[PDB]
């Protein structure tokens, strides 16, 4: 945990980021539901197969 002062210099357009996500295997149809993507500026992580 960190705490700092400052003045904001720029803001981004509000958007929607996915936390609860679900994917389907395109051919096998294997579906992997209720996947959690950790909050923050992290990317996605697809299955190998």
């Amino acid at each position: 945990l960190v705490k700092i002062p400052g003045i904001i210099i720029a803001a981004s357009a509000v958007r929607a980021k996915a936390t609860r996500i679900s994917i389907q295997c395109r051919s096998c149809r294997n579906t992997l539901t209720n996947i959690a993507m950790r909050p923050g500026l992290e990317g996605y992580a697809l299955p190998r197969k």
């Binding site: 389907q24 149809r29 579906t31 539901t33």
Partner: protein, 248 residues
Amino acid sequence: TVVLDDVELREAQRDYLDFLDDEEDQGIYQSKVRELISDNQYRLIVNVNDLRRKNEKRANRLLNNAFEELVAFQRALKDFVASIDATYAKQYEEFYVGLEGSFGSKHVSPRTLTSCFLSCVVCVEGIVTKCSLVRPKVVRSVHYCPATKKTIERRYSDLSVYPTKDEENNPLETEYGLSVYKDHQTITIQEMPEKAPAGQLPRSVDVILDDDLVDKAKPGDRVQVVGTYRCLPGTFRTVLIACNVKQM
């Protein structure tokens, strides 16, 4: 990617239904299905030369492309039976067509059964040597999902894969009553030992029997079976799917 209409299948099915519509003519096939209905079986027998006489083009179409043409034929047969009696048609999920009669080139022996005959009708004559046990083959399995309160089906046909979980990983319970099963036996045919050279090797051909065709054969029987000679999934293995069997 949903097929809408197959005009070729549409016309071919109609041609069979017209052929099966044996009322303007001698009634031989109309009587046969009537006798079949009384018999309570679900596998009509057909002489190919009747089809040749009524439609040479259709018969050539059938022998050169056994699979699709038969599927149209079984479609027409079930529709024709439903015409004569709906409920008796409703007894059975399907009906089957047994071929018979003369086949010029397609009437061969396991010695002469070349790879060229793949996907063609063939009337293989020979002697049974090996017979497998009767086993019930699953073809269509119905499952129920209590979580979703939803019924799901699957067909195998020519196609671990037994589904047990919903996409949401809900447990699935198989409706054993609604699922479709059929007895299924495998046998092997060889050339008649009298008419076979000592120099050459055996030519063993595997036969698949289903439904009433299962135990209409035993080891050491001289039979001729008409069926669709096909490859198998993987250099490949090849087997014959019986359409009708008879012990000469």
